[PDB]
Design an enzyme around this catalytic site. Structure first.
Site, PDB file in Angstrom:
ATOM      1  N   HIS A  30      -7.773  27.641 -11.216  1.00 27.95           N
ATOM      2  CA  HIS A  30      -8.005  28.882 -10.493  1.00 27.95           C
ATOM      3  C   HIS A  30      -6.842  29.205  -9.559  1.00 27.95           C
ATOM      4  O   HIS A  30      -6.178  28.316  -9.018  1.00 27.95           O
ATOM      5  CB  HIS A  30      -9.311  28.804  -9.700  1.00 27.95           C
ATOM      6  CG  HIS A  30     -10.539  28.869 -10.554  1.00 27.95           C
ATOM      7  ND1 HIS A  30     -11.808  28.971 -10.027  1.00 27.95           N
ATOM      8  CD2 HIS A  30     -10.692  28.846 -11.900  1.00 27.95           C
ATOM      9  CE1 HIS A  30     -12.690  29.007 -11.009  1.00 27.95           C
ATOM     10  NE2 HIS A  30     -12.039  28.934 -12.156  1.00 27.95           N
TER      11      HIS A  30
ATOM     12  N   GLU B  64      -6.718  30.169  -6.587  1.00 28.70           N
ATOM     13  CA  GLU B  64      -6.804  29.598  -5.246  1.00 28.70           C
ATOM     14  C   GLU B  64      -6.214  28.192  -5.210  1.00 28.70           C
ATOM     15  O   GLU B  64      -5.506  27.835  -4.262  1.00 28.70           O
ATOM     16  CB  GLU B  64      -8.255  29.571  -4.762  1.00 28.70           C
ATOM     17  CG  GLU B  64      -8.938  30.926  -4.711  1.00 28.70           C
ATOM     18  CD  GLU B  64      -9.639  31.274  -6.008  1.00 28.70           C
ATOM     19  OE1 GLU B  64      -9.018  31.125  -7.084  1.00 28.70           O
ATOM     20  OE2 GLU B  64     -10.817  31.684  -5.951  1.00 28.70           O
TER      21      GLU B  64
ATOM     22  N   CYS C 288     -14.683  30.704  -5.534  1.00 23.68           N
ATOM     23  CA  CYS C 288     -15.874  30.105  -6.111  1.00 23.68           C
ATOM     24  C   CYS C 288     -16.236  28.808  -5.395  1.00 23.68           C
ATOM     25  O   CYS C 288     -15.430  28.215  -4.674  1.00 23.68           O
ATOM     26  CB  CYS C 288     -15.661  29.824  -7.601  1.00 23.68           C
ATOM     27  SG  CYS C 288     -14.671  28.346  -7.937  1.00 23.68           S
TER      28      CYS C 288
ATOM     29  N   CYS D 293     -13.124  25.638  -5.695  1.00 26.58           N
ATOM     30  CA  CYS D 293     -12.167  26.347  -4.850  1.00 26.58           C
ATOM     31  C   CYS D 293     -12.557  26.273  -3.379  1.00 26.58           C
ATOM     32  O   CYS D 293     -11.721  25.970  -2.521  1.00 26.58           O
ATOM     33  CB  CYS D 293     -12.042  27.801  -5.308  1.00 26.58           C
ATOM     34  SG  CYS D 293     -11.081  27.996  -6.826  1.00 26.58           S
TER      35      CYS D 293
END
Ligand SMILES: [Zn+2]
Length: 185
Positions: A60, A62, A91, A96
């Site tokens: 992801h 992030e 999320c 994350c």
């Protein structure tokens, strides 16, 4: 990806940051980031610390930002405001929020400002994610017309073309912000 080297395609920006609920861009996140050094009551902008990231091969965006923090060469004796303009709120179920939480615990010289275009309620624990980020020191809000236009003007290969708002930008931002503010109490 540094904006000094590459700006975002305009339709990539529009497709990913539109806040209309009936459009479903669940596959991707785009995370536009910038950094400021908070110097004795002033914001010092760091023009080279600007860029954007997307999820890549299941990682992801992030996490990919946390991956590059070392390359930003932040002075741990200084204070920095990191701002995220992100198409989806971070999320919980894929890590994350926890990872961002841990990063902020052990990197107290950094203050994170997250401005999300949409709430990622595809994650059943999206509310737990938002609360974990708040409880970690991150200020989380929903992007308004002002933020969308700033990202258009800063991160997009727009060629002097002004921001063109999609229908209902303002209405969806108000509703999303009311939801987020209720979640964060
Ligand atoms: Zn995530």
């Amino acid at each position: 990806m540094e904006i000094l080297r590459y700006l975002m395609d305009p339709d990539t920006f529009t497709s990913n940051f539109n806040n209309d609920p009936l459009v479903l861009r669940r596959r991707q996140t785009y995370l536009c980031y910038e950094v400021e050094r908070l110097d004795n009551g002033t914001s010092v902008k760091m023009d080279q610390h600007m860029g954007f990231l997307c999820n890549e091969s299941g990682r992801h965006a992030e996490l990919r930002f946390l991956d590059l923090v070392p390359s930003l060469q932040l002075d741990p004796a200084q204070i920095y405001r990191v701002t995220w303009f992100i198409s989806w709120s971070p999320c919980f179920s894929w890590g994350c929020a926890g990872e961002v939480r841990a990063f902020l615990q052990e990197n107290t010289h950094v203050r994170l400002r997250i401005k999300a275009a949409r709430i990622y309620d595809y994650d059943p624990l999206y509310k737990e994610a938002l609360q974990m980020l708040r409880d970690a020191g991150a200020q989380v809000s929903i992007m308004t017309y002002d933020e969308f236009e700033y990202c258009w003007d800063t991160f997009v290969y727009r060629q002097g073309c002004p921001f063109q708002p999609w229908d209902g930008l303002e209405e969806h931002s108000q509703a999303l912000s009311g939801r987020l503010r209720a979640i964060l109490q």
